[PDB]
Amino acid sequence: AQDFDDWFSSESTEEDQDKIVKQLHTVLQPFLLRRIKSDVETSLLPKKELNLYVGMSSMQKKWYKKILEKTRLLNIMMQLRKCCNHPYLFDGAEPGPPYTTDEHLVYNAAKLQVLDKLLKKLKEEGSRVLIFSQMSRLLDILEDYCYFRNYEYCRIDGSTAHEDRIQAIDDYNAPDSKKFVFLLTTRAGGLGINLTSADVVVLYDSDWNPQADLQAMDRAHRIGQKKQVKVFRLVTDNSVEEKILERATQKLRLDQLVIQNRT
DNA sequence: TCAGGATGTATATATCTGACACGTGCCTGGAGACTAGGGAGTAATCCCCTTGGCGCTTAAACGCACGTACGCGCTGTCCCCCGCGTTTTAACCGCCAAGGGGATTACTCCCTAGTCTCCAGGCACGTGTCAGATATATACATCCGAT
């Protein structure tokens, strides 16, 4: 790898004039054969994105500052991603006992406040949303929030057997089906699962590996999809999520400069 | 169940002694210079630990059901151990003898350690092998429980 990693001049970024990369274009030419889905009209429909930025909530603003300045408050970087997702995960941020599922849950979640409105705006359009979230515990908050709004939902997350998985996917992929939100996790098993009878997914949380979220949005974008599929990605503002997305971005963009110019 | 005894438990009192107070001499804790080296701060570099997860194999752990054997309660029946009176004898002071042992308090002085300077042999670390010990199967021998 010394002749492969370092010789390539620090990923050919700070010491390249689009020449050494041109060399590697033909270096690994006779080893790979990558053919684009653009050249075939299988999905025959390009995808769409938003990167909507969520003004961070109030009680979250308390916690994020609290985490910084010095309960198992270890691995700080991901802890801040919990605060950026929902403070209710911190065991105590939510109002104490007794426990009720009401609008107070919606207030203390900067993403969910924005997400709630958009979940309404697609209800009238006959869309069915496919939430993909990290930290399966985060699903439980959405699950109960789904229970609060009287929405049709089913869950297929980790620790659910495939026979449970297949009946769950049938409920969503049924003829004249009625499920609106169907929960998963960013991994959600292999590519095999068929979600082409859908039109909108939500990447509630981003990931370090963009390819790990590339195929997840391909779950909807797979073959047979006729209508346009809409993919969301909530991004916390002036927080840890800001740096993760660009970290994914440059790793994502690394693919194009290396692979996406051969064929 | 109630009156009849033996035993601490208080009471007050004369006596012994051993804590408490006081004064001196001596040594050591404090003040004050001087210095040098131990540790605190910095800043590379590599490896491990954390917190979220995800998917898979495969034994253990759990639950359920007979169904014994044993933990427990009762009874009996010794026999052994406790309470009490009676002797008696061994501990416990007091003594005597002489000398040795062990602690101090000086003096003296050899010799054996620490303290340095060089300098090479240990020994630890990073490699590259082989063989001792598994794991399976596989046939063998060898208790255990029911006819």
Swiss-Prot record:
Native organism: Saccharomyces cerevisiae (strain ATCC 204508 / S288c)
Primary residence: nucleus
From-to range in the entire protein, with total length: 378 to 656 of 1129
Note in the entry: Present with 1500 molecules/cell in log phase SD medium.
The entry's keywords: ATP-binding, Chromatin regulator, DNA-binding, Helicase, Hydrolase, Nucleotide-binding, Nucleus, Phosphoprotein, Repeat, Repressor, Transcription, Transcription regulation
One of the record's GO molecular function terms: chromatin binding
Protein name: ISWI chromatin-remodeling complex ATPase ISW1
Compartments, record wording: Nucleus
Subunit structure: Component of the ISW1A complex, which at least consists of ISW1 and IOC3. Component of the ISW1B complex, which at least consists of ISW1, IOC2 and IOC4.
Helicase C-terminal domain span: 114-263
UniProt record, GO biological process: chromatin remodeling; DNA-templated transcription elongation; negative regulation of IRE1-mediated unfolded protein response; negative regulation of RNA export from nucleus; positive regulation of transcription by RNA polymerase II; regulation of chromatin organization; regulation of DNA-templated transcription; regulation of transcriptional start site selection at RNA polymerase II promoter
Role noted for this protein: Catalytic component of ISW1-type complexes, which act by remodeling the chromatin by catalyzing an ATP-dependent alteration in the structure of nucleosomal DNA. They are involved in coordinating transcriptional repression, activation and elongation phases. The ISW1A complex represses gene expression at initiation through specific positioning of a promoter proximal dinucleosome. The ISW1B complex acts within coding regions to control the amount of RNA polymerase II released into productive elongation and to coordinate elongation with termination and pre-mRNA processing.
GO cellular component: chromatin; Isw1 complex; Isw1a complex; Isw1b complex; nucleolar chromatin; nucleus
Family, as annotated: Belongs to the SNF2/RAD54 helicase family. ISWI subfamily.
